[PDB]
């Protein structure tokens, strides 16, 4: 049935994502010195200031003010005219530090309750949904041409959104595409939209998908000149959907950034992506969404649910059998299954946690073994 | 097919929700003096402090420090031993104020891009999903018996989670229920769990749903004595799922609290709940989820999608016909359709935005007219 679906993405330097990137940059910094560190680092940004606020239990010593300024500088906010300068903004920390003091470590219970969901679909190369994939790819391309000299009047803040017409389950094409970019006072609006259309949109959206009818809204109100934290406000854990799957699949509440791996909110979600992506790569289903939940102090998950939406190649009884076998979903088990105690997290914080094959949760190593046990074919 | 699903909720006084309630309390206060005010008030709480941070364009004058302290006092954090005192904590504001300066007001375009989803299901009295409904009802009952003298050793912070076994689409019963409550040093753990079980859980969970097998985890690690902001950290827009539908249905990124009605993130989502709830009350479907999206500076929605999951009583072509007719979904139209410019928002910020019939988006006034035009029956 023809039906349209939308997903947005934002760039590095959109204020919410700045806050994510700072949080995960502090996480990485601590993890580099102490991979067993427990962190929950929440960050807030507003026109003058970055507040980095936290509970951290670690041996490590790390410089919050330095880490912050460097993250704001790579994003590019380095002069008042943009909205925000990494070298003169205020950095404020309010992190509580604690230093450290079951027979099988794997049987350690979950710290905090909750629900996590994970998804895969055979509709892109990366086994991710088409909308959120291209949506991210628009903003990423913007950052690229910004940062490579090509289109250097572009400034950091940018939002993208793409709407896709599907008829059933086939992506038929792109109905509308919207893109808004901060830019210097230097460039005119009409020349801006020539360049966005040539350099950003045309190299990313598949041409077969683009029609005579495709409604493109480039800088629709726009003269987007100041942006980033200037006059807006970013907090970690607000681009929760963008981070995930653009609203194709579901979500339990939870944020990833600034949480070390002991946090099921993060690591359970990462593991869920991995179990689903492996299922689809083995051809056990076309589209798979999984809910796993935990209760505080219990180590086995309180629930698993697989929704293969009528797209199975083996009945869900057998499917849920293999899920709960090939994958250790005890909190410390999934930390092991995916080898998470490593500074790999700042890269996660812009452009989507999933869909980028070089992440431990994006590997399809278990594809065949799943294929086998699920009645080989 | 038997399959389990989970949803969590938290109380007023869980730190994220404190921050929500403060944001919406400032919204209400401004709206009482100036209903056309534009606000985006983001709040952060950590052990000593509340940072209320914002952009506000209004004539009104309102006292942030007073509003804050009063909200923290009704929640109950009024002494250091709890974790946090409303009368001695630090309140810090960083709100930018601006005072004010198409032929049809209704045709005014959307301010910001985005996607919103809304849901209804005939599975509860309130046309909301069973899990998130009971989950909320657990925490609400906790707050009630806390606040009515009955169980007065209870302190503010509490989390609940209920997992439901469904066989297909029938809620069969409650597999597990978990509940964790802050409490005074005064009460013992075992007597605590007698009382939680008698007074909170037993009057809320339907007994027919409770089995010999129902795994109840009351205070599982627990001696939860300090809580609220003490040693944790709350930010508005983190209980995004709880707010909604406990992960039964989808979400675009977006937070509600501290956003005045011009924000589609909020009002479009509210309107979507209303269009779906009306569809289901008219018996046009059993379960209905709707995605509506907007692009900045356009007034008609860029997409509408209805997923009636094989539960229609009329084909989705006709359904999407009636949706886009009976409901004005232009930003100013939905503000009108639901009469939103009123201080009604602090009540929204704990216990769920939906499912509570006395909200303008919970009315089923359009039920019959939808029934009619969708081929009367
Ligand atoms: N001292 C600490 N060190 C590291 N992480 C912590 C510490 N205190 C809090 N956290 C954890 O980090 C997580 C981030 O908070 P959050 O997910 O917001 O809780 P909730 O999901 O209930 O809102 C918490 O679940 C909490 O267990
Ligand atoms: N001065 C202002 N007055 C009121 N609301 C504002 C003002 N500045 C920002 N806001 C609005 O409040 C909304 C809340 O921010 P947010 O939803 O986080 O943007 P995004 O969805 O891109 O993250 C913004 O979409 C923005 O349009
Ligand atoms: K969020
Ligand atoms: K965090
Ligand atoms: K807000
Ligand atoms: Mg935001
Ligand atoms: Mg969480
Ligand atoms: Mg939180
Ligand atoms: Mg938004």
Curated annotation (Swiss-Prot), chains A, B:
Binds 2 divalent ions per subunit. The ions interact primarily with the substrate. One of its GO terms (biological process) is S-adenosylmethionine cycle. One of its GO terms (molecular function) is identical protein binding. Pathway: Amino-acid biosynthesis; S-adenosyl-L-methionine biosynthesis; S-adenosyl-L-methionine from L-methionine: step 1/1. K(+) binds at residue 42. Keywords: Acetylation, ATP-binding, Cobalt, Cytoplasm, Host-virus interaction, Magnesium, Manganese, Metal-binding, Nucleotide-binding, One-carbon metabolism, Potassium, Transferase. One of its GO terms (cellular component) is cytosol. Changing residue 259 to A: Loss of activity. Changing residue 238 to H/L: Loss of activity. The modification N6-acetyllysine is found at residue 2. It catalyses: L-methionine + ATP + H2O = S-adenosyl-L-methionine + phosphate + diphosphate. Changing residue 265 to N/A: Loss of activity. Disruption phenotype: Cells are resistant to methionine-analogs, such as DL-ethionine(Et). Its EC number is 2.5.1.6. It is found in: Cytoplasm. L-methionine binds at residues 55, 98, 232, 263. Its cofactor is Mg(2+); Mn(2+); Co(2+); K(+). ATP binds at residues 14, 157-159, 223-224, 232, 238-239, 255, 259. Induction: AdoMet activates the tripolyphosphatase reaction. Pfam families: S-AdoMet_synt_C, S-AdoMet_synt_M, S-AdoMet_synt_N. Belongs to the AdoMet synthase family. Homotetramer; dimer of dimers. The active sites are at the interface between subunits; each dimer has two active sites. Catalyzes the formation of S-adenosylmethionine (AdoMet) from methionine and ATP. The overall synthetic reaction is composed of two sequential steps, AdoMet formation and the subsequent tripolyphosphate hydrolysis which occurs prior to release of AdoMet from the enzyme. Is essential for growth. NCBIfam families: metK (TIGR01034). This is S-adenosylmethionine synthase. It comes from Escherichia coli (strain K12). The gene is metK.
């Amino acid at each position: 049935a023809k039906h349209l679906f939308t997903s947005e993405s934002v760039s590095e330097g959109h204020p919410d994502k700045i806050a994510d990137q700072i949080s995960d940059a502090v996480l990485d910094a601590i993890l580099e010195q102490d991979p067993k560190a427990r962190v929950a680092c929440e960050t807030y940004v507003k026109t003058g200031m970055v507040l980095v606020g936290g509970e951290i239990t670690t041996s490590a010593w790390v410089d919050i003010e330095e880490i912050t300024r460097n993250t704001v500088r790579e994003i590019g906010y380095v002069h008042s005219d943009m909205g925000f300068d990494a070298n003169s903004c205020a950095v404020l920390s309010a992190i509580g530090k604690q230093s450290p003091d079951r027979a099988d470590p794997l049987e350690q219970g979950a710290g905090d309750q909750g629900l996590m969901f994970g998804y895969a679909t055979n509709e892109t190369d990366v086994l991710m949904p088409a909308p959120i994939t291209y949506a991210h790819r628009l903003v990423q391309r913007q950052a690229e041409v910004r940062k490579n000299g090509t289109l250097p009047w572009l400034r950091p803040d940018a939002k993208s959104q793409v709407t896709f017409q599907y008829d059933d389950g086939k992506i038929v094409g792109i109905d509308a595409v919207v893109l808004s970019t901060q830019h210097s006072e230097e460039i005119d609006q009409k020349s801006l939209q020539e360049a966005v259309m040539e350099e950003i949109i045309k190299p990313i959206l598949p041409a077969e998908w683009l029609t005579s009818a495709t409604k493109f809204f480039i800088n629709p109100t726009g003269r987007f000149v100041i942006g980033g934290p200037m006059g807006d406000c970013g907090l970690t854990g607000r681009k929760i959907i963008v981070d995930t799957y653009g609203g194709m699949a579901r979500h339990g509440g939870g944020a990833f950034s600034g949480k070390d791996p002991s946090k099921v909110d993060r690591s359970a979600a990462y593991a869920a992506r991995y179990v689903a992506k492996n299922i689809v790569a083995a051809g056990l289903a076309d589209r798979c969404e999984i809910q796993v939940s935990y209760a505080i102090g219990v180590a086995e998950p309180t629930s698993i649910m697989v929704e293969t939406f009528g797209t199975e190649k083996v009945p869900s009884e057998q499917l849920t059998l293999l899920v709960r076998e090939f994958f250790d979903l005890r909190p410390y088990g999934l930390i092991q299954m995916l080898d998470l105690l490593h500074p790999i997290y700042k890269e996660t914080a812009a452009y989507g946690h999933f869909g980028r094959e070089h992440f431990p949760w994006e590997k399809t190593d278990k594809a065949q073994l799943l294929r086998d046990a699920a009645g080989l074919k």
